[PDB]
Amino acid sequence: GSHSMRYFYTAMSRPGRGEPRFIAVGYVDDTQFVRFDSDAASPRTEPRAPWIEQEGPEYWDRNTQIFKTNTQTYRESLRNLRGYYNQSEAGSHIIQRMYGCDLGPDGRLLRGHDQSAYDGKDYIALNEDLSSWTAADTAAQITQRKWEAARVAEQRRAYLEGLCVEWLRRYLENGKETLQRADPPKTHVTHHPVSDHEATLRCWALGFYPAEITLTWQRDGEDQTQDTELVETRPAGDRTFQKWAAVVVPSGEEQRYTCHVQHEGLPKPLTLRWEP
């Protein structure tokens, strides 16, 4: 199917408790492969997936050089943004950045991303054209002028259309046994009575990869969107994911209800019901 690579940067100031912390993590689809933490005893880029371990010394040292530079850079940027918003030096603040590339099922660039936030609020984004910016406010407008002066968008475009895609395709091949393997969900329906004449049907999906999945309950073939309790897809801790959907039904009417599962790893979309 489609694939993507993303890097996620988090820079956090902490007045009175040292210099701002910088963390970077890299992902291919729903698999993390690298980390960096400026708080680590010896800050360096560390592998987080087995298929990245084969990369030589020049890769790991180039990565570390970049993240070490970004640590210093984002500390300056935190200062800058505090200034743009007339904020005191007493508060803790966060810059987050998310960038990377999406490939279509054929393996060409679908689109690129380079997006930043301040205190969990969108700040500035590279537009889909990879040539222009969208600034959230008059503060971000200042960052935009800086980045237009330094021709940042041109340099992002070059990376996103070139190296990002090239490296993603390399990772997809090196880790093909995992990154290009879809694990279908193991599914079942549980039943828990709540009173004399109401009971809960819960539809389970377990051990699936990637995280993208659709669980829906139907009653008489009609979607139960407003009635379905739907938990957030959660990591099992072994690369795979878990999810459930629950509906409360009148006792005796359980056979009127059907759970539907859609996942990339399935030969066909599943229809489940409670088997007493």
């Binding site: 970049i66 940027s77 960052t143």
Partner: peptide, 11 residues
Amino acid sequence: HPVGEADYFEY
């Protein structure tokens, strides 16, 4: 592989 930044890149 991450994007390299030009010297003194700042917001």
